[model samples]
Target: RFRIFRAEKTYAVKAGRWYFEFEAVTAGDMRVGWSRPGCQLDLELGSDDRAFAFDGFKAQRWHQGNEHYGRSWQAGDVVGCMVDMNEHTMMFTLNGEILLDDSGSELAFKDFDVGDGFIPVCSLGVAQVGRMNFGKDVSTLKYFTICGLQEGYEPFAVNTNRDITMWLS
Candidate 1:
């Protein structure tokens, strides 16, 4: 069976804008991807946190099959990605090219920024390939590249050193 050899970390958004950069790879016919739901980026000083989700942001899955070929690099291929989140917009750029521009209503907070007094945790959501452990044959595991702004913080580079390994059961 395919499994992640490590635990996922959670990050909180600081004060300024930050960018996350990273890559992903798949093996043994297993599909890999990402999911984030009910994300709110833009906020008011005293009002309830602004909602940037799609009325009820479902965990949207993204991968090479959805014209996001950038995530489909070969076994040894190094694909890069960057996500820029500002006041009211979240942009997904693959290999320096803009691929998705989501307004505040469709942005996933779990994939983007967690507001003040909130903690954001990354879930290593993965499943099997052709067997329905939960009545399905689709599975995804992701290695994330996270970056964001914080109060009184200087902008720095986002770096990652993750290795993906898959085994068939």
Candidate 2:
């Protein structure tokens, strides 16, 4: 039996254009995607509708127990997850190419619920390790810049140690 380890980003976004990168250090039954705060961490990320995950092992998208085929990912591959909350859309990219749907169109998850904050989430099986970047570092931002989508985008940064007033004014 394989053990599942799941994690979520420290910050959640309600509205904004957010981009994050996840690099597979060791690939084996890995899943990466986003989920609401109410999602169950103990279970697989895409086990329910509150979450959506791309299973790297099977190259499929899992949501509410349904599977949608996707592209395969391997070690050293940088997977970019971008959420355009302002447009109510979510999508993923491999290396620099955007993932497309079966219809040959850009793969986009639509009508994402904004009332509940969505955060980056990932599940790793045995020997699977993933590194995440939430725009807190320079290299992460560079990834977005290389993709040519950094223009007009504000990086979401939250410092827990700082006071809420500091962020408001």
Output the number of the TM-score-best candidate.
Answer: 2
Q: Tens digits of per-residue lDDT for model 2 on 1-169? A: 3443333334567787777677877877888877876556677768777777777677777777745555888778887777777887777777877787687655557776786777777777877788766666645544576562654444444322233443454
| Model 1: pairs clashing at backbone N, Cα or C within 3 Å | 14-149, 14-150, 15-149, 15-150, 15-151, 39-109, 52-104, 52-105, 53-105
- Write the residue-wise lDDT of candidate 1 on 48-72 in tens digits: 3322211101223232112112222
The whole-model lDDT of each prediction reads 0.26, 0.68
What is the lDDT, from 0 to 100, of the residue 35 in candidate 2? 80
Which has the greatest lDDT?
A: 2
